[PDB]
Amino acid sequence: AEPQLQRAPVAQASRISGTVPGPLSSNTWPLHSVEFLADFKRSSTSADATTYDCVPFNLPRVWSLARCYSMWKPTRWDVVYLPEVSATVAGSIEMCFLYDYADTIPRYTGKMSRTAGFVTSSVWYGAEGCHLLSGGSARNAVVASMDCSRVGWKRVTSSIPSSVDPNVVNTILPARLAVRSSIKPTVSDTPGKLYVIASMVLRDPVDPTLNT
């Protein structure tokens, strides 16, 4: 055919609309995952509960994805206790959630029981929780569920301002998981494992390297 006589424009707009396509470019992105939280450490001297900040950057794998978004909203967050001790082991594991950073960490059973999301279990009970981490059946699992309803959209951070008014911390920290041992062993030990079954929604992308 005839060679086409192209008309050359002074320019030609180069335009892109919206976050460049890829795995985490959608306005929002829902994510469900099982994440090892920590060892159930049993102090032999302290009766104080151990605290765990329920925020994305504390979940290595989830964090990898979460740092690509600026906002997140927890939908599930459930911590399962997996026993790794015989049925001869005395003691109990106590768990509850603290929804205000300003609130004091429970130092004993009574305090723990009076706190939201409270749960206790024979340190050797709950192995069936292993099946929770995969399929389901929380029938015989030791789980501490965090109240996620009513939790709004939180900014995704890579840190927690700890030496700051608890009120500013609250703006980023939906809740803290408080884990306590009902008794003091003669020597520190680790009766089981704590795995988190988190479900959240990420929103509004951001270059990971900028996210803090």
C-beta of residue 129 within 8 angstroms of C-beta of residue 143 = yes
Cα-to-chain-centroid distance, residue 2: 65
89 is in an annotated binding site: no
Residue 129 binding result from a copy of itself, Ca ion, none, given CB thresholds of 5 to 8 Å by partner type:
none
The answer to the question of whether 207 is labelled as a binding residue is no
200 binds, among Ca ion, a copy of itself, none (CB under 5 to 8 A by kind): none
Residue 39, annotated as binding a ligand: no
Among 45, 68, 81, 180, binds a copy of itself (CB under 8 A): 68
Alpha helix positions (H), the chain: 60-66, 109-113, 166-170
Is 103 known as a binding-site position?
A: yes
Q: Are 69 and 75 in contact (CB under 8 A)?
A: no
Is 165 a known ligand-binding residue? no
Yes or no: say if 94 and 112 are a contact pair by the CB < 8 Å rule: yes
Query: How many angstroms separate the Cα of 189 from the Cα of each of 84, 93, 144?
Result: 11, 13, 21
165 binds Ca ion (CB under 5 A): no
Smallest gap from Cβ 6 to a copy of itself, in A, equals 5
Q: Which does 12 bind (CB under 5 to 8 A by kind): Ca ion, a copy of itself, none?
A: a copy of itself
- Please give the residues from 56 up to 115 whose contact with Ca ion meets the rule CB under 5 A: 100, 102-103
Reading the block at residue 145, the tokens are 């569920």
- What does each C-alpha distance from 159 to 12, 46, 67, 203 come to in angstroms? 44, 27, 12, 18
Q: How many residues bind Ca ion (CB under 5 A)?
A: 5
Handedness of CA 175, 179, 182, 183 (dihedral sign): negative
Binders in 124-143 for a copy of itself, by CB under 8 A? 124-125, 128, 140, 142
Among 43, 51, 75, 170, binds a copy of itself (CB under 8 A): 170
Of 33, 46, 51, 75, the one binding a copy of itself (CB under 8 A) is 33
Question: Which amino acids are annotated as binding site for Ca(2+), given as ranges?
Answer: 100, 103, 156, 211-212
